[PDB]
């Protein structure tokens, strides 16, 4: 829910680095393993930035999703 809110948050300018740091804090510090809703909420936010590094992050996240035994669906291709 926090990444879904940060995907549409336009109150401040730092929604994308806050989402990146929140994903890193969830994976590395909290010890949670990201499932399909985490990957979808992160890729939907990374697909909005036309910078090539964020697009590369979205492609690497989709490749890690398909490598970890999570097949692509209509939301992933979207």
């Amino acid at each position: 829910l926090q990444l879904k809110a940060l995907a549409k948050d336009n109150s401040q300018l730092n929604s994308l680095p806050e989402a990146i740091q929140l994903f890193d804090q969830m994976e590395n510090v909290y010890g949670f393993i990201a499932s399909r809703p985490h990957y979808d909420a992160m890729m939907f936010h990374l697909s909005q930035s036309p910078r090539p590094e964020m697009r590369l992050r979205c492609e690497e996240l989709a490749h890690k999703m398909e490598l970890m035994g999570i097949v692509w669906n209509a939301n992933t291709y979207l």
């Binding site: 994976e27 590395n28 510090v29 909290y30 010890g31 690497e60 996240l61 490749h63 890690k64 490598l67």
Partner: peptide
């Protein structure tokens, strides 16, 4: 970057 090394902390 897509598969980070495993940490001992936390």
């Amino acid at each position: 970057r897509m598969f980070p090394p495993i940490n001992h902390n936390f």
